[PDB]
Amino acid sequence: AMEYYIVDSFATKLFKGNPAGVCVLDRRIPLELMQKIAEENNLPETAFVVKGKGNYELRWFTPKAEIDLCGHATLAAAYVISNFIDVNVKKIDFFTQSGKLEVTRNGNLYEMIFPEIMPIEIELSPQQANLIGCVPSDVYSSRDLILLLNSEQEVINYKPNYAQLRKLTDWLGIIITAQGSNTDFVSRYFCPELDSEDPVTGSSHCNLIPYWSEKLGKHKMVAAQLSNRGGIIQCEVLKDNTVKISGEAVLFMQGTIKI
Amino acid sequence: AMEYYIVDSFATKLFKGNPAGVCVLDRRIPLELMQKIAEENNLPETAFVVKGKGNYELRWFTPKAEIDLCGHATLAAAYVISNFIDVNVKKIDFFTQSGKLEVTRNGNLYEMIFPEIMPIEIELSPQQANLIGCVPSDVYSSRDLILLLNSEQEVINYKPNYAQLRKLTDWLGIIITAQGSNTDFVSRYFCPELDSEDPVTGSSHCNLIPYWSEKLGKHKMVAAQLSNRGGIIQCEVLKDNTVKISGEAVLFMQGTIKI
Numbered sequence A, B: 001a002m003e004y005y006i007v008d009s010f011a012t013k014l015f016k017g018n019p020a021g022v023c024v025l026d027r028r029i030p031l032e033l034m035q036k037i038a039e040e041n042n043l044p045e046t047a048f049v050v051k052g053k054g055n056y057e058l059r060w061f062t063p064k065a066e067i068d069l070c071g072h073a074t075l076a077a078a079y080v081i082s083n084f085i086d087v088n089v090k091k092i093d094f095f096t097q098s099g100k101l102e103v104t105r106n107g108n109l110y111e112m113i114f115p116e117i118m119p120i121e122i123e124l125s126p127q128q129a130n131l132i133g134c135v136p137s138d139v140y141s142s143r144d145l146i147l148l149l150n151s152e153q154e155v156i157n158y159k160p161n162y163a164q165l166r167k168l169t170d171w172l173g174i175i176i177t178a179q180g181s182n183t184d185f186v187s188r189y190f191c192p193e194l195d196s197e198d199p200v201t202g203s204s205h206c207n208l209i210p211y212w213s214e215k216l217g218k219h220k221m222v223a224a225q226l227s228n229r230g231g232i233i234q235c236e237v238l239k240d241n242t243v244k245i246s247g248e249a250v251l252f253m254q255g256t257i258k259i
Ligand code: NI
Pocket: A070, A071, A072, A198
């Protein structure tokens, strides 16, 4: 009865990027049923789109809980809307727990506008320096901890110790970043409480874009997220202290949930 | 191009039992592609059925590797064959890494015949007794370690310590069992190296059936696997040192993989 899609966000090819389930509903279903569906899919997130008169309500669930924001699964939901629901629509508005989110389709690229957040350089305490599991060139701070490494090779070589990273309670996630070989810059994002590496992270680019824009002297850049799956992020510094984050999406599976 | 199904095995209702992906192919695809598909699904196993002239080849992949046996995903594959491929076929033969497997559909129950394996009573060493995290009434040994608890409540109350259970290297899995409140007997199965509790385990019933058959004086019994999802297993002692293990299956999602 409900249309269901598995989509790879920020992916140039199948099995890359950040995978999400996307469930498109004609009518409301209980939040407890959305949670059971997300647990059954066992994908990092299942997005639920309620198509109503004049608007889309969007919720996201991990296999364990409802969450209030998810940029990468929002890109997957916009891909589903413009490819199957309102074929070739350019502007997709979603009403969520965190307010209205807009996604713009530009060719086959999905664009999201986020606040520009230049991080601040900090000095780690001797104890914090022993928890990061590397010797960075510089350390920056925002919602996440940003570790500047000396090369793309050092970013690739890093092996997270989640037990140690969980002790860095001042930050949500741990970012490692460096200049890229094939791209302007690269990064990897670690989720210590989830014991996992995020395949592709849009919101880290709120910090990474102003930081690399200043270092490289560029307003338009390409970034790679060097996770196992890997992601490509189109980056642009906009006028009013905002940044544009864009990515491609790929369809893995199209079906129906029998409820 | 390939039909894809998500099925709950040993489940009387959706979101119960042991979930599996089932991919039905007209032609062979590379083993590396089957692995990528299993990793993309992120389900405990994805079963791949190759329908050829006169036979079915069956393989199973976890999100990490190909495996050589999987009774619960085999039940899901048989459910898919008899409900969608060869509608209402009663006998399903599969050719696998571990030889030929037969599944019989009896109404909506799927039957699998396994060897009867009466386990042997053992005495744990003081060190092993400290690793099991309980004080059992009796201890039995086979491929898995079997811990007889004093009630269904004690089975429900048990909370596995996988770090401690991983130190019991003499056994594959750790089984806790007791007489049931609503069923003849109950069990929970722990996979220490997988850091997980198995939702429903068919092969543990190779030991549990002869053991409870002798204790209860019954040839036909019903068992429950008291995992979070939960499973119901129809049990029967057969004539030639074999046992019959049966379960229901439920369809969660039907779709197509775009490859
Ligand atoms: Ni995320």
